[PDB]
mmCIF file of C-alpha atoms in Angstrom:
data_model
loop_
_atom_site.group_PDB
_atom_site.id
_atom_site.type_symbol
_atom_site.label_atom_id
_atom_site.label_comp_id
_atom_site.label_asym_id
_atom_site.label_seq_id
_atom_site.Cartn_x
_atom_site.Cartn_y
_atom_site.Cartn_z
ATOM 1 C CA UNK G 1 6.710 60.373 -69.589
ATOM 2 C CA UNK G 2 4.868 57.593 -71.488
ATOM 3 C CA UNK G 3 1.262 57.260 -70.743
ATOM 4 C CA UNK G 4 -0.798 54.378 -71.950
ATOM 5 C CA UNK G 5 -4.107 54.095 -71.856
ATOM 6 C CA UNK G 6 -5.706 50.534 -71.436
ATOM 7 C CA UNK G 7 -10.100 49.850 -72.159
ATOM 8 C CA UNK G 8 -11.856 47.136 -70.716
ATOM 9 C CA UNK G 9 -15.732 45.419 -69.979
ATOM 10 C CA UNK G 10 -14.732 44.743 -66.824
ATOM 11 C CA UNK G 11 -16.170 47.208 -63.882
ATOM 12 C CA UNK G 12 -14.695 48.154 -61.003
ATOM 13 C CA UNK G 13 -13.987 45.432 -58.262
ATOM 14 C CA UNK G 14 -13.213 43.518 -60.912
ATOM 15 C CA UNK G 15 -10.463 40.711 -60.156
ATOM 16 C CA UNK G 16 -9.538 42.050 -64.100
ATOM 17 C CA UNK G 17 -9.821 45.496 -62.578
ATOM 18 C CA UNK G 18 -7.798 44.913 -59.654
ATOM 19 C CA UNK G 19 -5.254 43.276 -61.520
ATOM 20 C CA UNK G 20 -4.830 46.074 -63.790
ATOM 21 C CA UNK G 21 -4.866 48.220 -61.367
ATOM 22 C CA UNK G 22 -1.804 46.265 -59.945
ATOM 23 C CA UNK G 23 -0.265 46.447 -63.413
ATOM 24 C CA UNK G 24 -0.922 50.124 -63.434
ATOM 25 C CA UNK G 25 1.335 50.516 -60.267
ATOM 26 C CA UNK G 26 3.738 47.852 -61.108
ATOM 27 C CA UNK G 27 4.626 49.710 -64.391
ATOM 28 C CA UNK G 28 4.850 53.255 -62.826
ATOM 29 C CA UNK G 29 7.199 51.408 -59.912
ATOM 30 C CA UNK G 30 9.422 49.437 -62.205
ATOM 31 C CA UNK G 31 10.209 52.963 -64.964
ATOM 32 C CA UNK G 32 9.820 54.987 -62.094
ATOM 33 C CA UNK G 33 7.165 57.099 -63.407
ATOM 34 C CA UNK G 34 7.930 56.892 -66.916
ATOM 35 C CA UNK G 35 5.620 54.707 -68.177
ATOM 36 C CA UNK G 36 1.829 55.099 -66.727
ATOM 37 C CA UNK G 37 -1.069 53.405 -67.413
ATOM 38 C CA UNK G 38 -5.083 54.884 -67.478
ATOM 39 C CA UNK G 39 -7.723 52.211 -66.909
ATOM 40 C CA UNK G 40 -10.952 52.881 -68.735
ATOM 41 C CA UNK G 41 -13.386 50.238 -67.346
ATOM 42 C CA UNK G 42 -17.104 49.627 -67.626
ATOM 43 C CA UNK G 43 -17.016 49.353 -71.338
ATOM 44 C CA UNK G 44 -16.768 53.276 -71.298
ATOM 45 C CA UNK G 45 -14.806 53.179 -75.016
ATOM 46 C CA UNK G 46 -16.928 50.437 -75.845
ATOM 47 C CA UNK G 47 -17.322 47.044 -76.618
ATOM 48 C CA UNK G 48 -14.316 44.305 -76.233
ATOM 49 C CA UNK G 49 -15.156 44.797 -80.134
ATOM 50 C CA UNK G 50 -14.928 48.117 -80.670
ATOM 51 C CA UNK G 51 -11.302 48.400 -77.667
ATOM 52 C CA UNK G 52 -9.869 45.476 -80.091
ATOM 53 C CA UNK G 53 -10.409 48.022 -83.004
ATOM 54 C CA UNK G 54 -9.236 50.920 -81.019
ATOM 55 C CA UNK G 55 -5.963 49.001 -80.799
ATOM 56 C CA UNK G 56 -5.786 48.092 -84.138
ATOM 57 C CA UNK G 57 -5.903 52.342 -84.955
ATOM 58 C CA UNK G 58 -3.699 53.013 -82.637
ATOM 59 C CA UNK G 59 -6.318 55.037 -80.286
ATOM 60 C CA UNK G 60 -6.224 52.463 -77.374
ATOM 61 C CA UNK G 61 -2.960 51.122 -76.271
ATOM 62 C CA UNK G 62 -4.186 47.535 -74.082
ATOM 63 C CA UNK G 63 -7.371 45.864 -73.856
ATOM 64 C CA UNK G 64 -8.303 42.171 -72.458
ATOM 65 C CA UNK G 65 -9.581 39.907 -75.038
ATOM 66 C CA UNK G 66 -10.277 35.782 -74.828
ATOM 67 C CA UNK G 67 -7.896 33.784 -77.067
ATOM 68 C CA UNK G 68 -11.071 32.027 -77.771
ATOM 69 C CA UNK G 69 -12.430 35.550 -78.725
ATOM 70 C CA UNK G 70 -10.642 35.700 -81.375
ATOM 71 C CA UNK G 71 -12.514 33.255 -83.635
ATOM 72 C CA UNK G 72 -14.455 36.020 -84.646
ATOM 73 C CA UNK G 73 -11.839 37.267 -86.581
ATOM 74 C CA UNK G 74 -9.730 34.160 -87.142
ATOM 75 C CA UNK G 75 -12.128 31.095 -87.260
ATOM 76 C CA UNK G 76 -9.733 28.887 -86.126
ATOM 77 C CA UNK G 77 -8.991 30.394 -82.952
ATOM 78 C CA UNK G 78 -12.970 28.958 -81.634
ATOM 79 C CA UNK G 79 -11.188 25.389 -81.343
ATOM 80 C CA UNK G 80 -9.698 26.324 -77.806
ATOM 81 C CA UNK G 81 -13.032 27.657 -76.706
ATOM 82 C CA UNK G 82 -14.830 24.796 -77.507
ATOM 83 C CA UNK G 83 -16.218 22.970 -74.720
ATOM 84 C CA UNK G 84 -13.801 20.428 -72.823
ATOM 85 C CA UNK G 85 -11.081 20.837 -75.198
ATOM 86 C CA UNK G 86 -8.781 22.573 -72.654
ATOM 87 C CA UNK G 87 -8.818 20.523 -69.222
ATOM 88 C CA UNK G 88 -7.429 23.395 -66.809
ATOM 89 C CA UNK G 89 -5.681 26.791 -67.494
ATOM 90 C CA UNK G 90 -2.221 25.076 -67.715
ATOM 91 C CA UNK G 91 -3.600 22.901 -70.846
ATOM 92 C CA UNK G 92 -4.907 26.710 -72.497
ATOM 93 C CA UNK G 93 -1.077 27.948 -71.675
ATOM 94 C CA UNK G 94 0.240 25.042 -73.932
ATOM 95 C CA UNK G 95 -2.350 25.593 -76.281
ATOM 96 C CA UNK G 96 -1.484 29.265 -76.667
ATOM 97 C CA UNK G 97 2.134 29.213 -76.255
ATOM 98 C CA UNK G 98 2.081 25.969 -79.031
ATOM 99 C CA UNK G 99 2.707 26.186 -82.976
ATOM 100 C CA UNK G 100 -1.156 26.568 -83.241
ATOM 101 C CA UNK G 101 -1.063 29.921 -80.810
ATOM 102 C CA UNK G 102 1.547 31.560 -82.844
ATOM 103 C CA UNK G 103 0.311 31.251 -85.926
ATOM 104 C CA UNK G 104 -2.939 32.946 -84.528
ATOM 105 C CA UNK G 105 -0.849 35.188 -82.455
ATOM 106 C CA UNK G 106 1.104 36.064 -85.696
ATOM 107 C CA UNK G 107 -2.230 36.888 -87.966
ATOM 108 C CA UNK G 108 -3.434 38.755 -85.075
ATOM 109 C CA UNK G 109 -0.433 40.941 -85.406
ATOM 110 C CA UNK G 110 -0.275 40.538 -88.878
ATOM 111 C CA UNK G 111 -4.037 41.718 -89.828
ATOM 112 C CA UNK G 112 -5.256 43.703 -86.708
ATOM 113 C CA UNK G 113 -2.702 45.479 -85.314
ATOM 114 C CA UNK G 114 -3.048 43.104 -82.072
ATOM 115 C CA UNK G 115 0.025 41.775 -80.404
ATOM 116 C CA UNK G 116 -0.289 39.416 -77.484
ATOM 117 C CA UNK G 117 1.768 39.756 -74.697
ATOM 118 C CA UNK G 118 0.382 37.179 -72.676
ATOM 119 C CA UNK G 119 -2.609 35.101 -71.211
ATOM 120 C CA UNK G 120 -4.150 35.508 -67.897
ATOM 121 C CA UNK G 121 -6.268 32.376 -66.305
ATOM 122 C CA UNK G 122 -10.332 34.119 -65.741
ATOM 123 C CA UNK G 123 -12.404 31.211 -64.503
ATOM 124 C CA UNK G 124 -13.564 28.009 -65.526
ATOM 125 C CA UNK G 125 -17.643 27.827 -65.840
ATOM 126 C CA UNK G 126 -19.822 25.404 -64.301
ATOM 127 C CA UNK G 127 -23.417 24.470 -63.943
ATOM 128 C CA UNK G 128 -26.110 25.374 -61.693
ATOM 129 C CA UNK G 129 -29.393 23.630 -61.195
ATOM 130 C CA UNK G 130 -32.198 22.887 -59.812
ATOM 131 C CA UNK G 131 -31.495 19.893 -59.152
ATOM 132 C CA UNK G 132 -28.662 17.887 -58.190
ATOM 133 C CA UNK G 133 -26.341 17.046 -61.271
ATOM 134 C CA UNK G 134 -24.722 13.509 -60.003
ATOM 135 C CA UNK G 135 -23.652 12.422 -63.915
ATOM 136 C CA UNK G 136 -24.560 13.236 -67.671
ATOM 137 C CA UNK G 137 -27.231 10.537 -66.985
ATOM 138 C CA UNK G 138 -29.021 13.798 -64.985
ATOM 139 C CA UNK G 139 -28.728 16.334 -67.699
ATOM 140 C CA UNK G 140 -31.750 14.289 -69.661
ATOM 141 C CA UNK G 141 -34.513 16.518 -69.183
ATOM 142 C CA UNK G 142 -32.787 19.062 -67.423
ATOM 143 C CA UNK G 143 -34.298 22.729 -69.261
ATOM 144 C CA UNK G 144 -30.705 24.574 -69.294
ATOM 145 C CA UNK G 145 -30.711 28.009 -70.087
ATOM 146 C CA UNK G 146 -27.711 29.020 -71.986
ATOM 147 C CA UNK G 147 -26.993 32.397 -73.685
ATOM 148 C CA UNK G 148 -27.491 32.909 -77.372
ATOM 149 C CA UNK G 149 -23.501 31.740 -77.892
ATOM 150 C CA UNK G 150 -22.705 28.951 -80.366
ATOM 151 C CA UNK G 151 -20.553 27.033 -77.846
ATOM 152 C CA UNK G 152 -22.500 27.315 -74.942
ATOM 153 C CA UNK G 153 -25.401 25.473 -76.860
ATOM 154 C CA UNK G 154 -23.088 22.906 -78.344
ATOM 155 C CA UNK G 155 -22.203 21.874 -74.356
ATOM 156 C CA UNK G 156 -26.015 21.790 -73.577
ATOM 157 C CA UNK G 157 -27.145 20.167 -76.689
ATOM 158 C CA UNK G 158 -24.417 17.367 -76.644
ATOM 159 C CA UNK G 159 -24.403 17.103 -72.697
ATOM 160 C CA UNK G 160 -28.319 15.866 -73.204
ATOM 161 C CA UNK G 161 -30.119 18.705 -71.498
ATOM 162 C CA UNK G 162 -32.699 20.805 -73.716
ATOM 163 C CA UNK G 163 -31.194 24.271 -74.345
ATOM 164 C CA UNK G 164 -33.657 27.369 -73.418
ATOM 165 C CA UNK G 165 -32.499 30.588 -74.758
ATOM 166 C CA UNK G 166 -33.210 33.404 -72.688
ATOM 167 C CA UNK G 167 -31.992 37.167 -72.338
ATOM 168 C CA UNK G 168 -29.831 37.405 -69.379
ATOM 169 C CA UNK G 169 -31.504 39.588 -67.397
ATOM 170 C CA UNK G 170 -33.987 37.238 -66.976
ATOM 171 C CA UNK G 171 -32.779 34.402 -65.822
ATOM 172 C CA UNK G 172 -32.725 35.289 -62.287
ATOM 173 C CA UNK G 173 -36.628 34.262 -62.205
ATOM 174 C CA UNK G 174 -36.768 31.793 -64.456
ATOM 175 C CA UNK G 175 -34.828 30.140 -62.414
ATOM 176 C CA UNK G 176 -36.773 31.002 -59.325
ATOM 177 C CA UNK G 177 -39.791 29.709 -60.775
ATOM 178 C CA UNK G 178 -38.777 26.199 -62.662
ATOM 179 C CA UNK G 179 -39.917 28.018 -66.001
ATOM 180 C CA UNK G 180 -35.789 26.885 -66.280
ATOM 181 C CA UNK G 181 -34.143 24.177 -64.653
ATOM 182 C CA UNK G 182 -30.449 25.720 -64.904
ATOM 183 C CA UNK G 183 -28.116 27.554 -65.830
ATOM 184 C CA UNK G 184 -23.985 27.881 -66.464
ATOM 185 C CA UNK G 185 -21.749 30.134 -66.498
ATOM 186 C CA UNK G 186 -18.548 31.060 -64.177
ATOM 187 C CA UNK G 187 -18.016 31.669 -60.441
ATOM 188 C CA UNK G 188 -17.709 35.142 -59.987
ATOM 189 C CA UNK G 189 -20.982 36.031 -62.436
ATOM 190 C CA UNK G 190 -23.043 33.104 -60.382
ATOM 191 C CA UNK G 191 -22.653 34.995 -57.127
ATOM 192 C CA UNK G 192 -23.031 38.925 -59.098
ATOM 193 C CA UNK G 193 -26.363 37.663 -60.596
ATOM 194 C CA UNK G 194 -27.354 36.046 -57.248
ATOM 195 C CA UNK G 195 -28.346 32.876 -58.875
ATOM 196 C CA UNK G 196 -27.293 31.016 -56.018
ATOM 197 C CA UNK G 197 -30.336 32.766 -54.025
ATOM 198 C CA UNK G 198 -32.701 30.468 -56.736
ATOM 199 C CA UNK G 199 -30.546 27.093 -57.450
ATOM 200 C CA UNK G 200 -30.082 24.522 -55.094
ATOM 201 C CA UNK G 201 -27.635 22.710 -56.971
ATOM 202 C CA UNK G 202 -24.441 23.332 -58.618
ATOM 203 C CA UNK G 203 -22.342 20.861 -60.318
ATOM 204 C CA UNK G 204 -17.751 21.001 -61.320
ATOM 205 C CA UNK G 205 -18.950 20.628 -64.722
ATOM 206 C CA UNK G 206 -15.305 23.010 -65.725
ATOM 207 C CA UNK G 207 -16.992 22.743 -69.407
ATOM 208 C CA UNK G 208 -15.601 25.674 -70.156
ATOM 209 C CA UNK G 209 -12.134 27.646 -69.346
ATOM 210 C CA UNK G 210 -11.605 30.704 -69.714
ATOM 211 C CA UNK G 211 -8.919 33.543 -70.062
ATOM 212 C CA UNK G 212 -8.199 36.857 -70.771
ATOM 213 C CA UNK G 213 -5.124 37.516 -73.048
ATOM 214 C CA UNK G 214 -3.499 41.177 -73.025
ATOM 215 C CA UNK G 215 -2.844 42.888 -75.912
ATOM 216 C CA UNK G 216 -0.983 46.114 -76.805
ATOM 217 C CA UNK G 217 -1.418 47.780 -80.126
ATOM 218 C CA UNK G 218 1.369 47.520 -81.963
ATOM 219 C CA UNK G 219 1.317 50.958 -83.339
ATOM 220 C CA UNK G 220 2.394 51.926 -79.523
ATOM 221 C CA UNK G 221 4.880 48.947 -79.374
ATOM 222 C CA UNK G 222 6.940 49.856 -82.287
ATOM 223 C CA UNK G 223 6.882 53.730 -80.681
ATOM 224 C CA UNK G 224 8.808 52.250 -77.496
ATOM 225 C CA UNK G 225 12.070 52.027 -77.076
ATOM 226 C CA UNK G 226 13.529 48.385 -76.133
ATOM 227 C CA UNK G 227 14.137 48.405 -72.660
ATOM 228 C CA UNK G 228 10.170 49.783 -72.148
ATOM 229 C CA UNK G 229 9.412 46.681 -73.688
ATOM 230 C CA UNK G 230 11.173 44.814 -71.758
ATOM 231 C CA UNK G 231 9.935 46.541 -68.897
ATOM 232 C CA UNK G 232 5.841 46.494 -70.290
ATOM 233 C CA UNK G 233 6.199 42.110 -70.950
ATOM 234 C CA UNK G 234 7.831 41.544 -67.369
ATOM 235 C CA UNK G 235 5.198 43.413 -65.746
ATOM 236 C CA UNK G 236 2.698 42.132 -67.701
ATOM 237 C CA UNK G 237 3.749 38.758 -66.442
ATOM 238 C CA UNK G 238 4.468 39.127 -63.479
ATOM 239 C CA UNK G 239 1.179 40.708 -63.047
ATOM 240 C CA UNK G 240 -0.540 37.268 -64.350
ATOM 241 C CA UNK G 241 0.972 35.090 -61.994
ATOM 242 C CA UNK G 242 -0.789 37.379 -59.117
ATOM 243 C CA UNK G 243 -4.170 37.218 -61.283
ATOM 244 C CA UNK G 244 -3.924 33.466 -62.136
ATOM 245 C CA UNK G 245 -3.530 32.883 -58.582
ATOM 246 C CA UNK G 246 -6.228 35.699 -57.913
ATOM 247 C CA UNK G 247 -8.690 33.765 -59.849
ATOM 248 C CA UNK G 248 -8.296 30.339 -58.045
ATOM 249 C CA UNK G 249 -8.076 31.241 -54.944
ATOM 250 C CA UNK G 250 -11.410 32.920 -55.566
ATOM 251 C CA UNK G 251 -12.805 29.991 -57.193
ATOM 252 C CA UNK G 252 -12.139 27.679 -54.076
ATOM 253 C CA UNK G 253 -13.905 31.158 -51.676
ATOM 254 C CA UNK G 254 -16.541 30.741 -53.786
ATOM 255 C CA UNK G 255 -17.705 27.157 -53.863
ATOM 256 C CA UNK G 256 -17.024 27.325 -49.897
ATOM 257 C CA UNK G 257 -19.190 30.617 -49.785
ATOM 258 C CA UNK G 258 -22.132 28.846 -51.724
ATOM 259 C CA UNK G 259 -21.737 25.709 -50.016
ATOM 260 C CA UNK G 260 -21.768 27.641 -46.689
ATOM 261 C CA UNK G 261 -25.498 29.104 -47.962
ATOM 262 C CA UNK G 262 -26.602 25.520 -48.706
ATOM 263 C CA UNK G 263 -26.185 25.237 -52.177
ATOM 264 C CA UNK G 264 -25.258 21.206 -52.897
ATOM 265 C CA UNK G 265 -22.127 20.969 -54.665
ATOM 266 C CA UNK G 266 -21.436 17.926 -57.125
ATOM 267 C CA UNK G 267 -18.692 16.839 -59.265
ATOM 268 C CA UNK G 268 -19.675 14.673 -61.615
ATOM 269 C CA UNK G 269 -17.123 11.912 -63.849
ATOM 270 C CA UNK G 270 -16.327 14.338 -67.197
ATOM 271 C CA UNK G 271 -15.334 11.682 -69.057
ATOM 272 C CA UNK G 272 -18.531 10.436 -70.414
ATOM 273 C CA UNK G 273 -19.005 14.309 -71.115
ATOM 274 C CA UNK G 274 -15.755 15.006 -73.101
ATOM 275 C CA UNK G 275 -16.821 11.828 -75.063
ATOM 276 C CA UNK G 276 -20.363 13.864 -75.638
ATOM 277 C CA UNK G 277 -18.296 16.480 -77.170
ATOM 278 C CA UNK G 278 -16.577 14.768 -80.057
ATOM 279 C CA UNK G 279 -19.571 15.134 -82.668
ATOM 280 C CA UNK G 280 -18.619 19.039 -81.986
ATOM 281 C CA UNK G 281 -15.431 18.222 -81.991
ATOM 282 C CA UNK G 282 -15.421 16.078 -85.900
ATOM 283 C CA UNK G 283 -17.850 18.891 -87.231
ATOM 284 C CA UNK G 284 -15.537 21.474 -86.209
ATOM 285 C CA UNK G 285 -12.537 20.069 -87.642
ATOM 286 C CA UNK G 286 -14.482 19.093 -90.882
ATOM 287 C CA UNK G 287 -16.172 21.988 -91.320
ATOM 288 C CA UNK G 288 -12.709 24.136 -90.830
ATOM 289 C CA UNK G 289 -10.498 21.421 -92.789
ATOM 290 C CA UNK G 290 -7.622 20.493 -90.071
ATOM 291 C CA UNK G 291 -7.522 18.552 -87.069
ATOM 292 C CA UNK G 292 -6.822 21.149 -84.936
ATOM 293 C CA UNK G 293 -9.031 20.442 -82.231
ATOM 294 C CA UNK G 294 -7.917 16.544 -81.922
ATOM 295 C CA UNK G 295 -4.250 18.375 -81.152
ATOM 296 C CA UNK G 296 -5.495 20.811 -78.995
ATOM 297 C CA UNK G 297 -6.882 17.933 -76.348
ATOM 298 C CA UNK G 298 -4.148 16.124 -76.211
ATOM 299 C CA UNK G 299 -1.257 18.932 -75.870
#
């Protein structure tokens, strides 16, 4: 038999748990116990950092990463993470599967070892609050707490709130006492952190989409024959479809669930906030030397 192994942050009840769970089985099924797969979750082997380098030795087979994750080792990779480039997870497909996400695909194979067999949609974030959000024309004033992340700043500085960094394990009564007026992040982590239980607002901002790609370590992919390939890339997949799906059907459970516990749900125009973004946007591309982000948008 072939047994992978496969790391990730993730914890159990995880919709990236559960889906790799289903991978797990769909694998076993489809080489009839040939190939299996071990999940490691909880971080156990580490950081998505230190699972990425795993890969890259040959010591971890799969791990999740963010295609936007990887501008930590390829700088240009940040410009689909940035906020409001991509629209929806169907715009981040044509952004990955475009020139642009092969030639980072290809240096991530190239340098670390990483091959990507796919991306997986995990959530868009939006933006809880004190108050309601109606319009930008709200954000003036509004003390958003945002974690100590470069892009998740950017969208509070440009969208006219005042950013308030803050440890995350606070936040739950900062919030409860005004000492911050909001917060963002996605779905799923809004309702762990019961942060709906201390914001009465929260607003479609989708500032922010998010995925998770899969990547095997090509150390193990050159080991297998052809036809496990084939077998390990249809599953993989197939798999995303389910999780894709997975992810916004949650989405839609959730603003119904928050809704249903009072929270006031907005949606405001994200034009005039896509607009905010383009000082990001010309610094980035200046800074870097391309226009890669002006592409990106409009793909």
């Amino acid at each position: 038999a072939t047994t992978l192994k496969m790391g990730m942050q993730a914890s159990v009840g995880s919709v990236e748990y559960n889906s790799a769970k289903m991978l797990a089985d769909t694998l076993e099924e489809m080489s009839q116990g040939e190939i299996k797969l071990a999940l490691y979750p909880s971080a156990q082997l580490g950081d998505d950092r230190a699972m990425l380098q795993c890969l890259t030795l040959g010591d971890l087979d799969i791990t999740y990463a963010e295609f936007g994750r990887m501008g930590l080792w390829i700088p240009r990779a940040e410009a689909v993470m940035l906020p409001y480039v991509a629209k929806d997870f169907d715009h981040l497909r044509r952004m990955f599967e475009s020139d642009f996400g092969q030639g980072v695909r290809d240096e991530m194979l190239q340098k670390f070892n990483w091959r990507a067999l796919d991306t997986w949609y995990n959530g868009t974030a939006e933006t809880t609050s004190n108050r309601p959000l109606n319009s930008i024309e709200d954000f003036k004033g509004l003390k958003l707490r945002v974690p100590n992340a470069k892009q998740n700043l950017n969208y509070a500085k440009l969208s006219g709130a005042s950013p308030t960094p803050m440890s995350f394990s606070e936040v739950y009564c900062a919030l409860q006492t005004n000492a911050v007026d909001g917060q963002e992040n996605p779905l799923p982590t809004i309702k762990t952190m019961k942060f709906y239980e201390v914001q009465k607002n929260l607003a479609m901002t989708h500032h922010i989409v998010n995925d998770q790609m899969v990547i095997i370590s090509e150390s193990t992919w050159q080991k297998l024959s052809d036809t496990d390939k084939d077998i390990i890339q249809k599953a993989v997949q197939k798999v995303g479809d389910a999780h894709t799906q997975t992810v916004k059907t949650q989405e839609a459970e959730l603003v119904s669930f928050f809704k249903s516990e009072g929270i006031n749900v907005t949606y405001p125009d994200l034009e005039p906030f896509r607009e905010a973004m383009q000082p990001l946007y010309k610094e980035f591309d200046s800074n870097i030397g391309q226009p890669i982000v002006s592409k990106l948008a409009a793909m």
